[PDB]
Each structure stands twice: as C-alpha cells, then as structure tokens.
Symmetry: C3
C-alpha cells in the first residue's frame, strides 16, 4: 500500500532557486506528485502548521523565518512518510547523512530547506491544513509496473 506525505519547500529553497532539484530527488524514486501549490506562508497558517510547538521560546523566530514563499507538495509512495524523512536528513544539516537534502544543501537547522511530515498523523493533519481535498489529484504513473512489486 502507498501513503501520502506533506513536503514543503521553505523560503530558503525558493530563494536559493533549488526547487526543481528538490522535486527531482523525489521523482527519481517514482514518487508521484499528488498536489503542488506555491503560496506565501503567513503567521496564522504557520501557527497551525507548528501547533506542536505552541508556547515554546523558539516559535516566534521560526514563524519569522518561515514567513515567505513556500512550495506546498504532496508525494505518494510506499512508506513515503518515513522515506522522505530519511531523504531530507537530520534537522541539523551538520548531523545529516551525506546524500540527504539537508547535508547536500545546507548548514544550519534554521535554514534547512524543506519540511516533511514526521508521522502518519501529522501527514494527515498537514495535508488537510495546506490543501483542500479538491487540490489533491489522483492518477496512476505509467511506470507503476516497474516501480511497485
């Protein structure tokens, strides 16, 4: 069975102009783009996105860093929630494995290029926060017979 995860390119990904490179890494595994939207993230939506951090001292600066253009994405694949986390690498780029997005592109946790859901529950919640159901597109990849066992 496949699942869907929420992935978001943060303002540093937009501004450093590496959006296509990020997308290509997920396409390369045969993950399917189920939704994609450019928007500008605002404090009110970011407060909900980061609801688990309410009241924490670092949240105001996090919301400031994230106030900017973002690319909202949903990718579908086998185990894609956990696998996308592995591909992004550790929160701290300096601790992330070579070959991961954060290790390959970044230096510090506050500018770490990309967000991905950390669990099935957060993926469901984040997809619903940033996308309406009518924005989620269902189609079958033509190479499915060679991607899935």
């Amino acid at each position: 069975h496949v699942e869907q995860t929420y992935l978001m390119i943060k303002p540093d990904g937009i501004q450093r102009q590496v959006v296509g490179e990020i997308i290509s890494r997920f396409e390369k595994r045969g993950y399917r783009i189920a939704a994609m939207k450019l928007t500008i993230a605002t404090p009110a939506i970011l407060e909900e996105h980061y609801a688990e951090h309410k009241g924490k001292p670092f949240l105001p600066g996090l919301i400031e860093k994230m106030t900017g253009p973002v690319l909202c994405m949903v990718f579908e694949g086998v185990d894609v929630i956990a696998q996308a986390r592995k591909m992004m690498g550790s929160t701290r780029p300096g601790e992330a494995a070579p070959g991961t997005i954060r290790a390959d592109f970044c230096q510090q946790a506050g500018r770490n290029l990309i967000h991905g859901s950390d669990s099935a529950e957060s993926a469901k919640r984040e997809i619903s926060l940033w996308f309406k159901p009518e924005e989620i597109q269902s189609y079958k990849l033509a190479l499915s017979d060679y991607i899935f066992e």
Copy 2:
C-alpha cells in the same frame, strides 16, 4: 590488484530509462567496463542465476519480474565486488543508505533496478553464466596512474 564483478541492470532499469545514469555511477570511480551486452533474460538462464533460491515460494514471481530486457555488465576495480554492493545499497530500497542506487531510485526489493555479485565465488559464477570468455575485453584505462596508488 583488481577484481571483476557481475552487474546487471534489471528490466525496471531499462524501462525507467536510467541505464546511462547507472553506468555513470560506476565510471565515476574509475571502474573499467570489461563487458557489456543487452539481452532478454529467459527463465532458463534466470533459474541458474537464482540457483540459490531453488524451491523457494518467491522464486516463480522473481523469475517473472526478471523475464525482460537486461543489461549484462562486468566492471573491474579494486575491491569492486564489495564496493559495487555498497554502491547499490541494501536489497530493500527502504533500508538502503542515501546516496546508494537503490535508495536514490527505488521503493521495493522486487523492483530494485540492479543486481551485483555478492562474493568472489558468485562473481566468477555469474560472469561465466552470462558472458562467454570472448566477450570479456581487456584494455588499460589511460587514467590508471591517477586512479590506482
């Protein structure tokens, strides 16, 4: 002291049209192409290739997935049997390390893009199974002084 390993691009590698990208990963380390042949794998040769799995319940479906176009290859280099295995990553792509072929391209073990010999004995056996001696080409890389210590 170099050795030779048998590497085979499976039908999913052919059909997803990533043959050149796969070859480039091995060329990048200065490994030498000693043999290369496109063929369509038959159940008869696949039964011998997968002789270790004789009588197992998954073997019939494994042979079915592999009955298709394959690129047979021999690469030469220092420790290339073990090193190519490390480059491919774990059999299951989800367990493979970022930066490996299987982690970068694949989702499931039944469609994991590439085969490589797992030992000196299996390399000798697999090369002999898929290639005649006259198909193995001996030449020296012009960059040898800068590849080998």
Copy 3:
C-alpha cells in the same frame, strides 16, 4: 560564527577533470570561496605540508603522487573544517560513506582526489603554507540571509 578550512584538489582531481564538480559540492551548501589558486606542488612545499610524516616509508611515494598541478582553496562556512572532512569521506575511499567525494570518485587512499584540513590548528598551518594572507579575499554572500539562521 564561521570558520575557514584549507581544501586542495590533488593531481588526480585535475587530471581526471573533475575540478568543477568538486567545487560545486562545496558551493551547493553555501560555502564561500575565500581563496583559490592553481599551482604545481613541489617536493619542498609537500615536505612541509606532510611534515608530520617525515621519515615514514610511504612518504617518498606520496610526494611523487602529489608532485603535479593542484588547486589550492579556502572555503568558509559554519563548522566547515569538520563538515568538509565529512563531505570528503574517509581517507580510504573503500571505507567512505556513499555520497562522499572519496566514495563517489575514488578507489584507493593514495589517489583520493582531495585534501582537507583535519583540525583548526591544521587549517591555520595549511592556509599559511599554501597561501599568502593577501590571497584570502573578504566579501559577503548575497544569499546569506537564506543560508545562515
């Protein structure tokens, strides 16, 4: 807080014509080129570079391998001394992690493409040996706000 490390493309990196690829890996993380110079390494400078190995049996052959064109470089970034070591990978390419320079390009320690300082003390010593302090250029990256937290 940023630091600077000494990175040097060895004659195999020059001769295999992968200089640009190497530079791009460090640029990709937002590391700043603070100095860059092509020279031809000579025994007298290499004896100082490898002073800690004076008298060891491998040193004469090492100096022979390293007598050739090199690209001297200083890169600046957060934790860049340790991070560049991680990006190069283990001295022995066969032990290096997939996704590192030495694992992706090399086979043996004597031809492992690149040198990087192993410590703050070594970076100061190596930068002073291979560059005049005047060749170190001060400027600020325009994308700093999206690279640094």
